[PDB]
Amino acid sequence: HHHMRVSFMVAMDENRVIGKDNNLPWRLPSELQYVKKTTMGHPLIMGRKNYEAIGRPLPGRRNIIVTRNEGYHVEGCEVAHSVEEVFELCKNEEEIFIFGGAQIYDLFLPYVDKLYITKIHHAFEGDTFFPEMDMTNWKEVFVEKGLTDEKNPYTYYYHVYEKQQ
Numbered sequence: 001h002h003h004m005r006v007s008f009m010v011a012m013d014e015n016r017v018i019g020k021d022n023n024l025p026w027r028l029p030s031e032l033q034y035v036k037k038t039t040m041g042h043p044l045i046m047g048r049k050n051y052e053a054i055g056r057p058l059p060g061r062r063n064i065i066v067t068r069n070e071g072y073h074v075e076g077c078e079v080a081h082s083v084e085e086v087f088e089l090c091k092n093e094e095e096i097f098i099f100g101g102a103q104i105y106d107l108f109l110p111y112v113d114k115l116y117i118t119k120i121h122h123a124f125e126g127d128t129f130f131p132e133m134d135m136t137n138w139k140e141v142f143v144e145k146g147l148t149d150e151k152n153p154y155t156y157y158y159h160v161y162e163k164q165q
């Protein structure tokens, strides 16, 4: 029914941890640069909790916040209250990025066409997890090692998977 490409944008560790105490468990400025590079000029779909942790609209992108709160408003952001409302707001977009967190990844999981997933080779303490996925009829179309240096202290890889079906 929907004609935009629904892409997940996520970074997780070896046990699918994405968050700890409503924040990121790691700092990888280089990984964040990849995110900015890949998401330039495309809508970001964010769970209300994800957005409020970020704290500000991200520039050069439509910021869409998913909440059940019908009175929720943020300057410089758009507000949606369901998957279908997001689809209406984005009906003419080429590609949208589901930017997290876990509740929002769960929400859009039946509709995901493309997965941009960074895998971090470390086991962090965490409380928030990326959902399990069946990768039947998906294919890895890109893989590259991330930059590990004094400012990026973990090993990690960028992966891109595309749904065939």
Ligand SMILES: NC(=O)c1ccc[n+]([C@@H]2O[C@H](COP(=O)([O-])OP(=O)(O)OC[C@H]3O[C@@H](n4cnc5c(N)ncnc54)[C@H](OP(=O)(O)O)[C@@H]3O)[C@@H](O)[C@H]2O)c1
Binding pocket: 009, 010, 011, 012, 017, 018, 019, 020, 021, 022, 023, 024, 046, 047, 048, 049, 050, 051, 053, 066, 067, 068, 069, 080, 081, 082, 083, 099, 100, 101, 102, 103, 104, 105, 107, 128
């Ligand atoms: N590593 C990564 O790639 C990454 C990415 C993003 C986030 N994170 C982390 O993940 C954590 C946040 O994830 P989270 O799951 O706790 O929160 P979240 O998914 O970002 O947002 C949860 C909120 O989304 C709204 N929501 C949930 N289901 C909805 C529905 N069916 N319809 C309309 N609105 C709905 C609700 O807002 P209301 O309560 O206002 O109704 C809910 O409280 C943080 O630790 C964050 O740092 C990590």
Ligand SMILES: CCc1nc(N)nc(N)c1C#CCc1cc(OC)cc(-c2ccncc2)c1
Binding pocket: 009, 010, 011, 022, 023, 024, 031, 032, 035, 050, 053, 054, 058, 099, 100, 116, 117, 118
């Ligand atoms: C950067 C990891 C990340 N990597 C990947 N591959 N996908 C993601 N969805 C996220 C993520 C996230 C959630 C997130 C939380 C946050 O503070 C708590 C700040 C940002 C952010 C800071 C500066 N420019 C833009 C965004 C993003």
Ligand code: NI
Binding pocket: 148, 149, 150
């Ligand atoms: Ni180095």
